[PDB]
Design a protein around this ligand. Sequence first.
Ligand SMILES: Nc1ncnc2c1ncn2[C@@H]1O[C@H](COP(=O)(O)OP(=O)(O)O)[C@@H](O)[C@H]1O
Ligand SMILES: [Mn+2]
Length: 430
Amino acid sequence: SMLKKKQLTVLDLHPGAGKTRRVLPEIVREAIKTRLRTVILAPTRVVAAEMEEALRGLPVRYMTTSGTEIVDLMCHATFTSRLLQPIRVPNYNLYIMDEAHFTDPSSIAARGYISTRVEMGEAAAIFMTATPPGTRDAFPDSNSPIMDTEVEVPERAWSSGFDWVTDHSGKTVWFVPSVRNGNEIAACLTKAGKRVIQLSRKTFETEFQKTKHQEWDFVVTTDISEMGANFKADRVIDSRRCLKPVILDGERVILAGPMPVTHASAAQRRGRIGRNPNKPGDEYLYGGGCAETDEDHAHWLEARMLLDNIYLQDGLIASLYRPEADKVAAIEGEFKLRTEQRKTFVELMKRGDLPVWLAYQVASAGITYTDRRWCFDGTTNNTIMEDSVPAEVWTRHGEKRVLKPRWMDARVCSDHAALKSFKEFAAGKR
Ligand SMILES: Nc1ncnc2c1ncn2[C@@H]1O[C@H](COP(=O)(O)OP(=O)(O)O)[C@@H](O)[C@H]1O
Ligand SMILES: [Mn+2]
């Protein structure tokens, strides 16, 4: 039983090798036999729901939101959200994180907490991913050979050219840098008669169900589909681009304009296809190169904001997982909030659905969750626009006010659904 060894192992078998569907159940059955207190961390509820079916026969308990006889299963974000709530930790001695490449703040924080527990000698851990931090190979092994081709990939709706895009009779997954860009690409495809499904973080649960059927031609998805999303596809079109949230001078979050993805992201996007060992010839068409410039990526600082507010024995604060710990301009403990503000901080993230950085600014200012005056009293440059006109909301006080938050985070108004959500928050609807 290697699982009792207080160590952290990175299971880095190539995409499609069977980490999720074959190795994970083998580990789980060994953990149950050795009577370990085990948690399985899936990146998304969709993937967690899939795991709940595969582990039907085993004593696995899916936690939507007894320790040695039952294995707990939850999302990365659910695990981190629980670490933030007021009681003592659940005290697992084996952590299994699947799709451990996920770079959203809750996943980064979870890896930091877990790796700290291992360094304390209190647990073992397995991080499953073909693309651990520092990977520089965008073209890893696959179950069947992949036809890789560099081509110009449309960044924009097109009315001519790019016949190879629509002169395809199979199923295509197209990775776009943003929801807004995906909306434009999807509309262009639909207009060419294609059946298109769009995926983003906010819509992933409901919309992914559509992809399990025969009747679609394109999936247009942001990077969220890098996290264990399974498609019956024969082609991936990759913009090779993403947006990067960047904190400027500790004062505002901008979404840096579409820039090259990391090698890990490129490998995971390409890794959607070539998964059938008896079906060669899946295509990966990519439009540009990769880059590693995540030193100013807001997610690792946001992860430190989360970890600074997870309370552990004797006032220890967890460090980031070492291979990704050099990427952050933050000192351990500097974002630690006192009890009620930490409560407000969590509320603004969970109930308010605000980005970590924005929730932190509001909470550390001593503002209570229900007090929305900060959404309207910001500096004039923070005015949020909507179809070239200042956005306005009706408040619960019966006032029509211009949306002008005291702190500006571009993620609250980067697409129509985000702006609609933030307007409802500013209006006091949740
Ligand atoms: N619903 C399914 N039914 C049958 N096979 C599947 C299903 N989903 C995935 N597979 C296949 O199982 C194999 C292992 O996949 P997986 O364990 O997800 O790989 P990894 O986690 O290492 O990327 C792959 O060939 C994949 O195509
Ligand atoms: Mn997997």
